[PDB]
Amino acid sequence: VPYNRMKLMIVGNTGSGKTTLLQQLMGIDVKDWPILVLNVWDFAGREEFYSTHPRALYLAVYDLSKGQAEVDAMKPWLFNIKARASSSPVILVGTHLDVSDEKQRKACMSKITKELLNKRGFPAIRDYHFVNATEESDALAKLRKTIINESLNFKIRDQLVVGQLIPDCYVELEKIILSERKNVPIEFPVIDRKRLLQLVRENQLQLDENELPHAVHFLNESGVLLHFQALQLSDLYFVEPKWLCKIMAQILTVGIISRRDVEKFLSKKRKFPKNYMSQYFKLLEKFQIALPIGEEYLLVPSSLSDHRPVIELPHCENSEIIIRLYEMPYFPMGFWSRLINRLLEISPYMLLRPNRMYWRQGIYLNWSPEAYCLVGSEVLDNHPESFLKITVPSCRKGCILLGQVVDHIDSLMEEWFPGLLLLKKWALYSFNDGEEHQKILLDDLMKKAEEGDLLVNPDQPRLTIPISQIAPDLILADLPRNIMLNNDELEFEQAPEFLLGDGSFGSVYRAAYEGEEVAVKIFNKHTSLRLLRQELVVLCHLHHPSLISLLAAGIRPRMLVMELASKGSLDRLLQQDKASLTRTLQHRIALHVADGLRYLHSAMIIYRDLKPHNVLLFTLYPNAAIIAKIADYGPGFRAPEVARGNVIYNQQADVYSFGLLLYDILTTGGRIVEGLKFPNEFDELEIQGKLPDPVKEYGCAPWPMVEKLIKQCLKENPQERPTSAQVFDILNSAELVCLTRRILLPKNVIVECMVATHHASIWLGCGHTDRGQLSFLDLNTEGYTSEEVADSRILCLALVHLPVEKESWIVSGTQSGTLLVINTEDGKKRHTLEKMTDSVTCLYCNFLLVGTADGKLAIFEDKTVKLKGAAPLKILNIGNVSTPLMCLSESNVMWGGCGTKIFSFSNDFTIQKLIETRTSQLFSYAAFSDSNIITVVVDTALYIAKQNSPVVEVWDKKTEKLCGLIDCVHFLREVMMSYSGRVKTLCLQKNTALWIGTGGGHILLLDLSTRRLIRVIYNFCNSVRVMMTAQLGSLKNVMLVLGYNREIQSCLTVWDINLPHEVQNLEKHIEVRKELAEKMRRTS
Amino acid sequence: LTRRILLPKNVIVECMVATHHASIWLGCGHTDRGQLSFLDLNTEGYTSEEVADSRILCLALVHLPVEKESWIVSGTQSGTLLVINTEDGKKRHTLEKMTDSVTCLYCNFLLVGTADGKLAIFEDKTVKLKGAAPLKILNIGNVSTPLMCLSESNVMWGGCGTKIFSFSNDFTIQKLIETRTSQLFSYAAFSDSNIITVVVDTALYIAKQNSPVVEVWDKKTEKLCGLIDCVHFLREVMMSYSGRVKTLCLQKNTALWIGTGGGHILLLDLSTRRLIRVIYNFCNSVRVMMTAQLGSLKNVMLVLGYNREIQSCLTVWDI
Amino acid sequence: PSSLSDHRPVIELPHCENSEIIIRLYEMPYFPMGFWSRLINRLLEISPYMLLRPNRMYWRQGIYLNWSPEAYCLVGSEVLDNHPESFLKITVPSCRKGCILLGQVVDHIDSLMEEWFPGLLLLKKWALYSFNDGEEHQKILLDDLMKKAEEGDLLVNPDQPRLTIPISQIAPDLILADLPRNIMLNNDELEFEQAPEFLLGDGSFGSVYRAAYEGEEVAVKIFNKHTSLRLLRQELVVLCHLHHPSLISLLAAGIRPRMLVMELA
């Protein structure tokens, strides 16, 4: 709809009377003026808003009776206007003509015809008038006509350039919001409820990701409400303009003042939340009201004395100091307060606190007679131009100070006062102490710097000056010793065959430095020096192992020598050699990139460009201290948020990009990268966020943990995405590396036993129902079936393998005592062996050993079990009706548990010893010692776990003695009723790793050679049921951990058997790099 | 003998030479013309007589004990050299005019360093001749790069611009060390400066114009051995003390004397590179220091400086 | 504070499964007021360290104590629907520290039964247990449990022998697993003949012989069917912290034979 509102800006210097002018025509006095409704903002006072947060007409007003001096005073205003809205209309009105002779009128008339109306650099003043007085005038009648017609003309001009007129149509929903924001009654008008207000007005502009940002954008430009977009009080805090302006302006007037006393007053004036108060102070900085000095003080630039304090400097002879001048036509408004804010952090030691003094127009730092610094404004007669003077003592520390000062000045101007980049830079020098200084432009000194000569007096050769004394910042004399270029080491040709690449900065060549391969950036005639120094500022102070460091810089040919990667870009590797890209290598690359991001984010630097092209590899050797680095720190791969082209980049944009990188690493084919070849789908795909399952879609081997990390990372909402610090913490995990698969079982399925086929599937029992039900899991497809095969509940399964006969059978022992034997090659071949006198408690198998609940052990001949109703070879009575057999272990002598005794068998099945273990109660606790044995692990000692024990007993089988206890509670006691500490199962690996499962979702990794805790693996599931060691169909060894996850959920987790080693190796890797980070940062 | 000898108010001396047999010839720096003054250390007498139109930049003693005569050679701003017999002040001789002003002298034969980097060599007995031509002239520097230090300590070390020369028995450049590479250490503004004083024992001690540090070079490998930080020593001392080095004197027992632009003189042990002691508030600005032997054969340091009303003061310091 | 009500705060405990805790019951219709005042005076002495002052919560007729996630001890009065006979209930986790806390508490309760009810010994002692976590508990009269203590076997379910319980869990204070490690009787070292030739003397609990415990002549006190088990540990309480050259040292107890081994010289 045809929006008919436009802002009116009234500006001028203090004393003009322009407020009354407005009243006759009809911080800041804001009010509507229906004529066309103008939103009039009367900047009667010094409301920095015109620079601190800069469809409007600029009415400039000045007092004619003051004259031409005032006209010149308006140049900074005109500059600022052009600098933010060069296309906007400007009407210049002089006033108080009734007390100003026409001499002044025509003097000022000629003044503006000579210096403003036809002068570039000013925003082409559209018209002008002279007014007798604010009482009314024919001139004002004409002015009213001028303003109306010209504002119409302006919008016509916008249509010619922008494409919008004074009835330009804007989405009506935005118009509605304006009205909704108008209707707001809040005591402390800081708004967050806006989300609700959207919901109050039905739900308009529902594209929160696009329309909402546009509405907000409009609302600031239209002068309705204020976002403050890195402040915390920014996005969710829309504040009424009247309060922003009023309160901050008043507090200024309510010069060093302690923060706390300001807080005291403020708390009485307006009871802001202390959180808001911290932001309040941050806003005072942002809006140039007050600058932070120490953490307890504010400078308050405005109102500082403007009578440069008497300063006596040490050093007097010309050669003792260095002087630099900046010639300007006028200082921009706010130039000084911004400059001061930057200069306050200067320090010659950053590579005692200084006696600081403030002039408003200058800063004096003292430090020491050895090194001090004075920056301030000075003006000479017959030179209308104003200008800066910088003075430092001529020595290395003085140089360092100078470098920091001029870098801040140039950066200030590039960001805030472009257009000037005027700024005639002069250096002062003399050929003899006691004489006057001579001026020279730095450009000419640069011409001489290229020669490398001494400055020579053209009339007298005897008089020369080393350039460094005049301009030690042209020659890079302020570099750290560590990066000064040694010209006897650097070896390069600048020949075509060494060209590695180029850019707007010049070119890059391959070279040698101190015997190493390096890259040399050359600033080959591209506004050099300034670009060079900008790069030097960024490169220094960033010293992380994952970044490309600077290996010395040198002004003689203007070079940056940097580390050259030996294996090249990740991109190439992804499309060059998947064999190098092992699972181990991939993980390490992810860590190194994550560190770089964490570091740069803590350094307040947004990378904005992660991709395989920017990742460099320095060795493909998986176990190296440093593998990947991020290039050039300081396309179709964009976050969907920033892809809109209407928001601001931040760490969350980088995180999103990182997630995509990880996705690209996961699928080593670079399949989405291949998608780039069809960019119309590729860029949109990323925008949609609808990425395909990396496993299913590309045929990529499973990698859980990472898979969910990517999903967690790539969220639509920036506020829901993980921080880069968190991303790293997640990557920092042995579990991440070694977890390979996780299969959930169907809801309410309880498996009490497992048999993996050593040849890729698992036979599962089922204790959920009370019926003999046998299930089956296909690891190749995660397929699952199940059928009832017996009456009573299946207790134990065993695999009979007869490779000689080319067949195999599953033996199912159950509660009834029967043995159901089923051919694995033929489901129809089912038969039952001689029924046992009691239930089957365990199976082992060659002989099929059947341990029953009455302590009886049946031994069946290897092949005999094929026949239905077959009897065992022999039967032993080991225990009794109350002492069931529960474990047959063997690692050709058998060992096992019967009640509280440990038995052992010969190859003739004879008892070789009955070890009563109950006697261990002299140690530990009798209710733990006196309990049925659950499992026996046979190594160089026996490891016994008993039912409901928290302690594992270690026995010396050679002497039958207790040789130690393992307290599981203790280990988890060190870890900060899920902590039952009950031992569930024991598994043993011959590399000394001992795997102990427990009641809660924890797995302890112990070191058999020292009996020490390697690591606690936890938050696995609700409870661990069984653990198996099994070789997969790809010959990999893994742990099969079956657990409960009560909603009776249960699941199978597959771990890479080398977990114990990965835990230790990863830890080492990280610590080494941690030390290197400190090494680098400390050198500086 | 720490004899505090004062000259008339506003007397300024730009050069000097002591007779090594008890008196000192001094150049009248306070005038606009080559005038040669003379100090009698036996009576503390002081006189003066004009010798040239341009000012005297350097004095040197020529002595022919086989001829039983001696002369003071006055190297002036004009480039001419006036030779004045000390046994007869009216017996004067003129040496061939140089292509630029004379910055330094060293006398067997007389070496003449000039502002345009030339080294004229005059055979000893040509001192008796007027309009005398030099034995040999070396092309060392140029109009932008003056020759100023003639330090024999039997070869000649030459301070010319930023380079160190070593001359043979037949005036061949044995060695040439450009000291600009020292910029990796210290500070470029100091490093890149004309060499004023060269002292040699086991190593070279280089005082450059307006430097607060002295470079130490290895004559055996032509490498920087280290730096002597004068302003640091003054920092240790609890614009009067700029620390700019004015002169280096050295006694065989490693007694390095460093006169600074202020009232402090540093005494440093070159066998360990340690500050031995400091002469405090000697004068307001020390100009030069000449090791000399008195009429009593006492080893003294002729510390000449100003107590600025510019007051020239010569202290016959007790070594 | 005796001014407090009998309130019983809803405190979530660790060890929520039946096998995770030990439950001891003392039945009697009423324990006259003043009983619990004397009880808490004795309960505020518990300390397993003696063989920490935790966030205890006195409940007037009992106390929470807290101790730790690992070991805790709740003691107090109880009553059930259709079971008007009141009773005391002790809950400690099934571990040695719990056993220690329990052992000290049950001795304090019986000390009170001797104090508050001198000669009454009602006061029925029951071991509350189950054969499976989540199941209903059953009670064993400790007199019968002691008959089974003599057997030394597990509680065996005669109808379903597959269900057995390690008796010391049922009653941690039955078998002295909560002694100072140095006085647990090593049954392989107690060379005790029990013949008349070894007689030293006698006492109300039985008789006193001697043995060659760990190769050293020691005195042996046999609690010969005159309130054995009980008197034995009560003597051990006296012996605990009893240290002087003029006194007879304890050279290991022995709950299995009910025979104390003492210094002999």
Structure description:
The complex is a heterotrimer of chains A (1084), B (319) and C (265). By secondary structure, chain A is an alpha+beta fold. Chain A contains 28 helices and 55 strands. In chain A, the strands form 14 sheets. Chain A has a seven-stranded antiparallel β-sheet with strand order 12-13-14-15-11-16-17. In chain A, a hairpin with a 2-residue loop joins strand 21 and strand 22. In chain B, the strands form seven sheets. Chain B has a four-stranded antiparallel β-sheet, with no helix packed on it. Chain B is globular, with a radius of gyration of 19 Å. Chain B has one domain (1-319). With 265 residues, chain C is of the alpha+beta class. The longest helix of chain C is centred in the middle third of the chain and has 20 residues, at 96-115. Chains in contact: A-B, A-C. The A-C interface holds A 839, 853, 881-882, 884, 919, 921-928, 930-932, 948, 950, 969, 973, 977, 979-980 and C 13-17, 19-20, 69-70, 94-96, 99, 153-154, 156, 161-162, 164, 166-169, 172, 175, 177, 181, 184, 186-188. The PDB classes it as signaling protein. Keywords: Kinase, GTPase, signaling protein. It forms a trimeric assembly.
